[PDB]
């Protein structure tokens, strides 16, 4: 049928072709194909709110970090779009071997199913970070530096948080001492880079820590840790039930905090060959009952 300038259906077909291949095989799109994905998804991102208000049913996913074949397993097990609705929490690139195929498939599904597929910004969707941790090198090796800058301009337009049915608050990192009204998130203008401190930084960088009472300093060198009492007060003040975030590897692929007031999701099993963790996604049905679908390494 009608092709379209983006050649989108062909791109998705070639990305999904390697479902039947030995893991590790590259999918080498053209530069202009990738730029098209960046420019159209950028326009879609800016046309939707920076604080996404979503309905269940929905499957929520944590970090992928370029583990493209684990992304394909997640879709194969959870259902390929639009069979399921998806919200990813960021950290698509860096650390893994195939950040390119990973982000390209994600951007392509964003364009294909723009009301049923959602991507938040993680702290690695940031030039100062993915310059160092792998994505820049991958872009330079398989394409050129200009394409990396095109990705950066796209990433600068990613939305930052989501609220599911007024009850589950989702972001990549966590809470902020400056987050007092949801309007403060809505007022963040795009495109923006990630600052080294402040609200946008903490939403992408902060971590829960049961061993701190309120706010602690974060081992990552930026942002904060926050204790169980901070979570309880935040949920109470905003009439929320749950914080759903990612950003930290967890042995089971999901991990509860503060009497299940917070869950951490992480969707890259055997994280960059250094850990022996499972990857998981959280299925949220229309009653807001939450369960987990897990990819568990055996070998």
């Amino acid at each position: 049928g009608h092709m379209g300038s983006l050649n989108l259906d062909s791109i998705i077909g070639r990305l999904l072709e390697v479902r039947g291949s030995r893991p590790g095989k590259n999918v080498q799109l053209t530069e202009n194909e990738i730029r098209g994905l960046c420019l159209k998804s950028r326009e879609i991102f800016l046309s939707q709110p920076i604080l996404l208000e979503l309905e269940a049913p929905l499957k929520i996913c944590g970090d992928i970090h370029g583990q493209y074949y684990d992304l394909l397993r997640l879709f194969e097990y959870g259902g390929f779009p639009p069979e399921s609705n998806y919200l990813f929490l960021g950290d698509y690139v860096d650390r893994g071997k195939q950040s390119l195929e990973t982000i390209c498939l994600l951007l392509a599904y964003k364009i294909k199913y723009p009301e049923n597929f959602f991507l938040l910004r993680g702290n690695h969707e940031c030039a100062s970070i993915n310059r160092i941790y792998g994505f820049y090198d991958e872009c330079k090796r398989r394409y050129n530096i200009k394409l990396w800058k095109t990705f950066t301009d796209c990433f600068n337009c990613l939305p930052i948080a989501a609220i599911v049915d007024e009850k589950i608050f989702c972001c990549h990192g966590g809470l902020s001492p400056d987050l007092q009204s949801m309007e403060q998130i809505r007022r963040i203008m795009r495109p923006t880079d990630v600052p080294d401190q402040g609200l946008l930084c903490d939403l992408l960088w902060s971590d829960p820590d049961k061993d701190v009472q309120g706010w602690g300093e974060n081992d990552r060198g930026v942002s904060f840790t926050f204790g169980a009492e901070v979570v309880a007060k935040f949920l109470h003040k905003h009439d929320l039930d749950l914080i759903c975030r990612a950003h930290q590897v967890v042995e089971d692929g999901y991990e509860f905090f503060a009497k299940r007031q917070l869950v951490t999701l992480f969707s890259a099993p055997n994280y960059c060959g250094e850990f022996d963790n499972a990857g998981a996604m959280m299925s949220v049905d229309e009653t807001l009952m939450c369960s987990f679908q897990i990819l568990k390494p055996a070998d």
Binding site: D9, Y77, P82, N85, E115, N116, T287, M289, S291
Partner: protein, 46 residues
């Protein structure tokens, strides 16, 4: 008040790193991963 957890509904697929990704398909390798004409039932963005 509304969110609940049904952990008994958890499901786990085991895999080797060298396995074809299609091998986690619950219904096997004949399932169609992508139909370019399939529409979503309804949007979830408010």
């Amino acid at each position: 008040k509304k969110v609940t957890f049904g952990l008994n509904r958890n499901m786990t697929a085991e895999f080797k790193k060298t396995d074809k990704s299609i091998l986690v398909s619950p219904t096997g390798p004949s399932r169609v991963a992508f139909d370019p004409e399939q529409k979503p039932l309804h949007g979830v963005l408010k």
